Amino acid sequence: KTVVVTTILESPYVMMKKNHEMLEGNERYEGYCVDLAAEIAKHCGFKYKLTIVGDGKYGARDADTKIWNGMVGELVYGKADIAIAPLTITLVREEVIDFSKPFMSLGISIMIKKPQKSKPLTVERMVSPIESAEDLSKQTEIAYGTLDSGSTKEFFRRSKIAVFDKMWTYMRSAEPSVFVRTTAEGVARVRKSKGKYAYLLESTMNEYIEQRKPCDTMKVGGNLDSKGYGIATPKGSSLGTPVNLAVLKLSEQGVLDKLKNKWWYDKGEC
Amino acid sequence: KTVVVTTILESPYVMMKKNHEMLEGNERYEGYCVDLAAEIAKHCGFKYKLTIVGDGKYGARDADTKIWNGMVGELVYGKADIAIAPLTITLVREEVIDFSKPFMSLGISIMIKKVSPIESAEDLSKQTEIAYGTLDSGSTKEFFRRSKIAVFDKMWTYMRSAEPSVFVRTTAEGVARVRKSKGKYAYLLESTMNEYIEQRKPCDTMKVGGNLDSKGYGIATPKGSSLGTPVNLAVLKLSEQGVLDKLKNKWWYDKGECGA
Amino acid sequence: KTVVVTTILESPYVMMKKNHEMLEGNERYEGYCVDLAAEIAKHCGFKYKLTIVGDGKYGARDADTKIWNGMVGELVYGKADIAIAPLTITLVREEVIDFSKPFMSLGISIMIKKVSPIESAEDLSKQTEIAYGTLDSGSTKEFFRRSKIAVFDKMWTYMRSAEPSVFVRTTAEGVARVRKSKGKYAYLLESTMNEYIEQRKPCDTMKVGGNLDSKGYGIATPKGSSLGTPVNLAVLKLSEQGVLDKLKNKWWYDKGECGA
Amino acid sequence: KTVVVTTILESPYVMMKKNHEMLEGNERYEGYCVDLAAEIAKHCGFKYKLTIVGDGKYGARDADTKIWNGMVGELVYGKADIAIAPLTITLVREEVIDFSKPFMSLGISIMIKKPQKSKPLTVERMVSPIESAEDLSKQTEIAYGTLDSGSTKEFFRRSKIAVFDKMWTYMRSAEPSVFVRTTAEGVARVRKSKGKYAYLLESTMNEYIEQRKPCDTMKVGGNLDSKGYGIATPKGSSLGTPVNLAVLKLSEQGVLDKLKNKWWYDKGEC
Numbered sequence A, D: 001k002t003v004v005v006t007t008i009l010e011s012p013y014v015m016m017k018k019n020h021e022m023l024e025g026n027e028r029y030e031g032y033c034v035d036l037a038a039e040i041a042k043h044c045g046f047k048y049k050l051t052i053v054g055d056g057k058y059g060a061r062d063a064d065t066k067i068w069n070g071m072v073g074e075l076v077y078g079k080a081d082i083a084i085a086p087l088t089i090t091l092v093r094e095e096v097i098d099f100s101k102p103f104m105s106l107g108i109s110i111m112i113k114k115p116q117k118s119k120p121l122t123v124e125r126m127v128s129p130i131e132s133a134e135d136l137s138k139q140t141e142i143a144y145g146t147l148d149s150g151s152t153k154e155f156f157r158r159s160k161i162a163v164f165d166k167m168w169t170y171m172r173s174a175e176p177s178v179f180v181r182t183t184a185e186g187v188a189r190v191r192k193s194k195g196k197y198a199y200l201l202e203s204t205m206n207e208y209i210e211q212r213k214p215c216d217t218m219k220v221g222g223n224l225d226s227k228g229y230g231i232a233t234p235k236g237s238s239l240g241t242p243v244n245l246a247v248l249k250l251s252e253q254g255v256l257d258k259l260k261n262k263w264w265y266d267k268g269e270c
Numbered sequence B, C: 001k002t003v004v005v006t007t008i009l010e011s012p013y014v015m016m017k018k019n020h021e022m023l024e025g026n027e028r029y030e031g032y033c034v035d036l037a038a039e040i041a042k043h044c045g046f047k048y049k050l051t052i053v054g055d056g057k058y059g060a061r062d063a064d065t066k067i068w069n070g071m072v073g074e075l076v077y078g079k080a081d082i083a084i085a086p087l088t089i090t091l092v093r094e095e096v097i098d099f100s101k102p103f104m105s106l107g108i109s110i111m112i113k114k115v116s117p118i119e120s121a122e123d124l125s126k127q128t129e130i131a132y133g134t135l136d137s138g139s140t141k142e143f144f145r146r147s148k149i150a151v152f153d154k155m156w157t158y159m160r161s162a163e164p165s166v167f168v169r170t171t172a173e174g175v176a177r178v179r180k181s182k183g184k185y186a187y188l189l190e191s192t193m194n195e196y197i198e199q200r201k202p203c204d205t206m207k208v209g210g211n212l213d214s215k216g217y218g219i220a221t222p223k224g225s226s227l228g229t230p231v232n233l234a235v236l237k238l239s240e241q242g243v244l245d246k247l248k249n250k251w252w253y254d255k256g257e258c259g260a
């Protein structure tokens, strides 16, 4: 009996092949997450089928309806068996599912449109109107928004730090809506907003987007926090311990570092 | 019921307070791990007594004896209830004890005396004139011993077959040996201890190259214990609300006794 | 008995003189390989007639039919007696024909139109904006096809799954395609032809990086023939006497019609 | 039936371990040639034993007796079965033994004691009293010699090029004798002669010696010719085709280049 692997279309984790039209099965997808699933299968023997979540969401719990959507909702209600996807370990998620030891470290960063070079001996330098989250909160001419129904939005919602509280107070009562439905939508808003918008996303996707063409976006300031991505399984399932030791073994062998290097920096340009 | 806590003397995590001669209980200890234990006890709701491991070892299994030592031996043999200390999460420990979610990122770092001729680990392996060592019975020696990569294989062959013995008994001994070798000996340890040492006096060592890999410290509980989920959820909450970051900043950067 | 020699029209090895319209026999050919054939015939003591391969292919086996073409096909099927031409010594060819000792060292090189951004082969593979090809039915293509190295595997996947067809029919076609690509196309070919091209007009291409591997050209003789030992000993004698070095200097460096 | 592999104690081809006293068998020796022998055995299965020649010579036919001494002598007479050692392909050697395809290209070079840097804006530049073989032959204050009973000595003896002829005419009649019994003896002569001696040796050994400490020797000019190293086998023996095919497979797979890189350039002491 094969298990269901639920994923989310996000680069470079789960991308779509340019020649996927006539391909059927797990061979249509490629990226970091498919390689991680292959290595997990190699360590502990099992057959898997890759599925993309229906709603295209990472997972969130409704305030009143009190149900989980996205991959978390898929795992809790039994529609899937394991989620090999960039799912962030959070306090609320751990109370409903089981998270393995993180296979990648990350943080909350800022994405802004890369500013024009400063002409004024004859050296060329770059200036940025945003240098950190504090000065981002202090100003008003540059708006900022996050990805809806994600770990970052919930972190900003429950944050008790004064600067993050101010940022959340702005975001929750901003017209027009500053949130986006997908990471690609947020990046597109950044690129088309002539520098009048800043995107708060995970540092891994931030670096990935910065490295590729048209290389017109850059990351400013340090990581707002330190989190990770875990492989999630439903509470009490028998697939938790095997994938835990699988992740540990992959970390010890150095396969994870090689995968990060070959999917993130090896394909860079600009 | 008071919960016994095993911990090791390793600055800045645990330090012997200056007035510990007139102090008793857990009031004679200070550091990052003391505050972490206090927060864990406050969240879970248990009373704890901080006891230092008898031997200054972290944990390993002797070949052809299969006996655990250090704090891991304290945990598996029932002599200790929880290990709130910089215990690196490894495969050989996950099969014996329960590790919580990581609370501190770290990696393998190279320390030398104050051009950086060595810089890279690969270039370090390409050189024989300068010597390098590691702490015995730790996650570093076991990582180098069982690493199947060519560079790490060469490094482990170097360290195992070396005279005089290049490993050090304690991390402080390793840093002293680096200091008093006139730049002929290098020490490999976790990046956190490296940063803490290089930010302190006499500020005569640096950190070169980069982290060889990435690991994390975790709160350790005996396999099947009842404190696993409470401490794991406590660690997640503490990281979520930023207590861990503030503790690290207080015990690592807040002093900075050097020009930087 | 006149010995039939199969050879290919590749400069500077074999050229069609300047007035081949008024010449008959072997007097209408000139080049390094013509001189080498003359020396081999003089040493062994046989009369030879130089015949050009009908199809401008060096030789390869075709999948699902296992039929040899080019000069190797001309040799395994009895149509030719010897192949005095720049035929790279390879594994697949050695299983069906007798190769003499190498008489000219060579390697696989990269050439782009006139610091070059391409640098080495690893950067050339990593950088996708520039396109790289290879002459079809040649040892370089067969080298990349069965190569198990990661960089060469990526390169072979690129060239195989490329639109339009990045391969070229002849070496001159590849050189012209690089020249007229405005710096968008890179040609992979043997070191000797690359140097000969880059030391000639219009002197607008340069060889970059290093050699991906080291190989050699050999005199090809049908398996189990009576000419293999005499030609191998002749090659050894010619190399010892410095005739091969003299011929290479005459046909490669003696002209130098460019600024260098 | 185990065949015997004959080698010559030459670095970095066949070297003695620092703990060979307590070791017995094919584990005492190490270097490039032992790895080549291991790979040849792996590709075509056979058991082998490593032996060092008693006379410590590569091979040379004696005048007025027409007998071969050294590795070629012990392979021709049948006392050995295969010579996996840096044996140069020569015309005289190929007429008595079957010699495989070359596994490494080499050339005759010149090694002199590295000269002191010139003091005289403030840049330091090195000057050498020898720049090629021509000005080496023309002068008379710097002596030069070659390994006795080797391929280079026979190349110089039978050479018809005018400069090489003059060099051999000097070498064959010169007191005291300029030839050396071993390559290490020639290197020691170069280092102890304070620069009044030059040594002619293979380019591979020359580069290896230059890259080791104390690196007081350097190579001048360029290679006088192009030659190779092959795996020797007695004439009309059953091992010729297997080892030829094996060395071809090793060359195509890229093992030879990696071995050369790991034994020659990896161990750099200057």
Ligand SMILES: NS(=O)(=O)c1cc2c(cc1Cl)N[C@H]([C@H]1C[C@H]3C=C[C@@H]1C3)NS2(=O)=O
Pocket: A101, A102, A103, A104, A105, A106, A228, A229, A248, A251, A256, A257, A258, A260, B089, B090, B102, B105, B214, B215, B216, B217
């Ligand atoms: N360099 S990286 O961000 O791709 C990265 C990050 C991490 C890795 C491995 C890599 Cl390659 N493994 C660790 C794991 C190893 C053991 C210690 C912590 C977890 C369990 N988690 S991590 O610290 O989140």
Ligand SMILES: NS(=O)(=O)c1cc2c(cc1Cl)N[C@H]([C@H]1C[C@H]3C=C[C@@H]1C3)NS2(=O)=O
Pocket: A089, A090, A102, A105, A106, A226, A227, A228, A229, B101, B102, B103, B104, B105, B216, B217, B236, B239, B244, B245, B246, B248
């Ligand atoms: N900045 S730091 O090294 O003190 C640090 C490091 C880490 C923190 C929190 C902090 Cl403050 N939390 C993560 C944990 C939180 C949740 C997400 C990953 C694990 C589970 N581990 S970590 O990535 O090792």
Ligand SMILES: NS(=O)(=O)c1cc2c(cc1Cl)N[C@H]([C@H]1C[C@H]3C=C[C@@H]1C3)NS2(=O)=O
Pocket: C101, C102, C103, C104, C105, C106, C216, C217, C236, C239, C243, C244, C245, C246, C248, D089, D090, D102, D105, D106, D226, D227, D228, D229
């Ligand atoms: N200088 S060159 O490229 O024209 C060149 C190249 C080579 C030459 C001779 C010359 Cl002149 N001889 C060798 C052969 C001679 C004997 C030693 C190795 C093979 C057998 N092959 S080679 O190393 O490919």
Ligand SMILES: NS(=O)(=O)c1cc2c(cc1Cl)N[C@H]([C@H]1C[C@H]3C=C[C@@H]1C3)NS2(=O)=O
Pocket: C089, C090, C102, C105, C214, C215, C216, D101, D102, D103, D104, D105, D106, D228, D229, D248, D251, D256, D257, D258, D260
């Ligand atoms: N780079 S090197 O000198 O170590 C070197 C030299 C040579 C290699 C391989 C290497 Cl790695 N293979 C060739 C062989 C391959 C095929 C073509 C010529 C012989 C048969 N001989 S070589 O040209 O003498």
Ligand SMILES: N[C@@H](CCC(=O)O)C(=O)O
Pocket: A058, A059, A086, A087, A088, A147, A150, A151, A152, A153, A200, A201, A202
């Ligand atoms: N990676 C986050 C969502 C992306 C984001 O919030 O930027 C998660 O898995 O919840």
Ligand SMILES: N[C@@H](CCC(=O)O)C(=O)O
Pocket: B058, B059, B086, B087, B088, B134, B135, B137, B138, B139, B140, B141, B188, B189, B190
């Ligand atoms: N803190 C590490 C030991 C440090 C080291 O590896 O040197 C451990 O518990 O494994």
Ligand SMILES: N[C@@H](CCC(=O)O)C(=O)O
Pocket: C058, C059, C086, C087, C088, C134, C135, C138, C139, C140, C141, C188, C189, C190
């Ligand atoms: N001369 C080569 C072909 C050149 C190439 O590989 O491009 C051969 O005979 O194999």
Ligand SMILES: N[C@@H](CCC(=O)O)C(=O)O
Pocket: D058, D059, D086, D087, D088, D146, D147, D150, D151, D152, D153, D200, D201, D202
């Ligand atoms: N390398 C030569 C001998 C050494 C020399 O001539 O310098 C050979 O194998 O014959």
